[PDB]
């Protein structure tokens, strides 16, 4: 067939129930997360060809970068909270990866200070349960999956692409190949 399990994508032996349409892992440690975010915009490319209705999902996960990593999960709930997601997601990864200039919780919080989000309404958020139940929806969202890598895409919970088996001489052909397969699962 042109689309094969083994190929662009592979099944998980052990499906999940009730699990997101789709479901995105990331870490703002992750290089190539990096990449999917600022050179190929996967999320943006991937909702560009998904049907209507299918709604899409996105985590970060604990596994990289020790403390740190926590509390970028921690702050991935108050953006998600305060629907900020989109403002503060390119310098968070600039931060980590290319300046250096995130070491610590403070510096997370100065992230979105500069992206316009009020002190108060960052440390209440911080600090609130709706955050805190965010958080264990990530947490039971990764451990749901066995997941111990990323960037990571799961489909219905069923299908996890897998752009290994994908052409990277072009990375739009990629991109459109990997959007094409999420498309492809979200039909099966």
């Not at 209705?53 to 108050?78: E, R």
Request: one cysteine or more; hydrophobic letters at 40%; aromatic letters at 12%.
């Amino acid at each position: 067939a042109q689309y094969e399990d083994g190929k662009q994508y592979t099944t998980l032996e052990k499906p999940v129930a009730g699990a997101p349409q789709v479901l995105e892992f990331f870490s703002f440690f992750c290089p190539h997360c990096y990449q999917f975010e600022e050179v190929l915009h996967i999320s943006d490319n991937v909702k560009k060809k998904l049907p209507e209705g299918v709604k899409m999902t996105k985590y970060h996960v604990n596994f990289m970068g020790g403390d740190l990593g926590k509390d970028l999960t921690q702050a991935w709930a108050v953006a998600m909270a305060l629907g900020v997601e989109d403002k503060v997601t390119v310098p968070l990864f600039e931060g980590v990866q290319k300046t250096q200039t995130i070491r610590s919780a403070s510096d997370i919080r100065d992230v979105f200070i500069n992206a316009g989000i009020k002190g108060e309404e960052y440390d209440a958020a911080w600090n609130s349960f709706v955050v805190k139940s965010l958080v264990a929806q990530q947490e039971k969202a990764a451990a749901d999956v066995q997941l111990r890598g990323v960037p990571a895409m799961f489909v219905n919970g069923k299908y996890q692409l897998n752009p290994q088996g994908m052409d990277t001489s072009n990375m739009d052909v990629f991109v459109q190949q990997y959007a094409d397969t999420v498309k492809y699962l979200s039909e099966k």
